[PDB]
Every structure is written in structure tokens, then in C-alpha cells.
Amino acid sequence: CHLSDLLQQLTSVNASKPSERGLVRQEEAEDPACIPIFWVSKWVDYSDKYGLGYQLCDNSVGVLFNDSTRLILYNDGDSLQYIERDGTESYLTVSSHPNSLMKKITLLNYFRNYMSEHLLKAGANITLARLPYLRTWFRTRSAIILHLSNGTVQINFFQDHTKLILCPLMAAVTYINEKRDFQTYRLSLLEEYGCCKELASRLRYARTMVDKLLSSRS
């Protein structure tokens, strides 16, 4: 889950009140060695009927269906992984699949084509192993919260289009601002050096969202 480590890391940075530094040195908290491998570059909320489709920054695609099963298409365009509710994984391809999966494969194909023709790709200015899948997601009035199977939590804010990619394994957070600058910080260094009021506010929201994920599981 790693959610508990993330909650600890966020409560700690927020307790340091990072936007009340006599001198904020936010740039000094950047750490290129913590750039995340995976984040969600596009998503499509079709959850009143089928579910939530998304694209990862490596151009792989996934759907978390409303029955809480998952189908992941690797970025070779053919290799598939199916994950049942309990997490049981099967490996298959579009060319060779059980007929029971035809409907769900058809739906993933619709999502994938749409996200290849339409949306802007978050983090596109930044460059077949274990792909994470979408464990859970929810949306508020101000944001959509995405929880990946490798423990990263991504929060996309609707009103100003900024995004947080939180990785508890590196104890790091990546902030994509309005201008689509992509900046990766070590959370302990934001504790040390501070940050602007805007990012401090998103990090406060982030803690509350991680708390929600922890209080919501299974």
C-alpha cells in the first residue's frame, strides 16, 4: 500500500509549515534522481457506464472497470494484462484472448484510440517490465485522485490544471504547474528549504486525499 508511509511523509512536511520560511529556497529542494518512472498522462472518466480509462507516460493504456477489474495494454499495442478484483493477474494479447474478455477489450480499444487522437499529454516534455495499474480513484469538486499499484498517488487539480505526482518509495513529489513546468522535489528537502504558498496549499490538500485513500481501502 505504501499509503501509510506517504501519509507520514506528508504530515511531516506540512507540520514544518514550509511557506512560512524567513527565506524560501524551493529550488534547492529539487532532486533529479527522484524523477518518477510512471505517471498518468491522460484520463477519461466514463464511469457512469464502463469505468475510468487512462494512459501512462510510456503510452501504455489501462481501464479500471466499474466491477473493479482492470485491463492493461502495454506499449507494444498487443500485450495485455487482466487483473481481477482480488488482484489475480492473467497475461494475454489482443490477438489471442479468451472470448469472455471481448467486451472489455473492445472498450479498452475505444479508450486507447480516443487518448491517442485527442488529449494533451501531461509531462510530454519529459522522457515491458512491471507496469503499475490503477488500484483506485476518486474525484472531488476540485481534483481527481489516482492511486497506482506501485504506491504512487497522482492528484490533478481541475481549476488551474496543476498536478502532483507523489511517490512514497522515493519520498518525493513532482509538481506540474500551470505553465507545465515539471519539477521533482524531495519531501524532506521541502521540509528543509520551504516552498511557495501555492505548492504548500496543494500539499495540504494532498495529505487529506491520502487520508481519504487510507480510510477507504477494500
Binding site: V40, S41, K42, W43, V44, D45, Y46, H118, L119, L120, A122, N156, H161, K163
Partner: peptide, 4 residues
């Protein structure tokens, strides 16, 4: 209903 879809991203940025």
C-alpha cells in the same frame, strides 16, 4: 470528464 477527461484530462489536461
Amino acid at each position: 470528464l477527461h484530462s489536461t
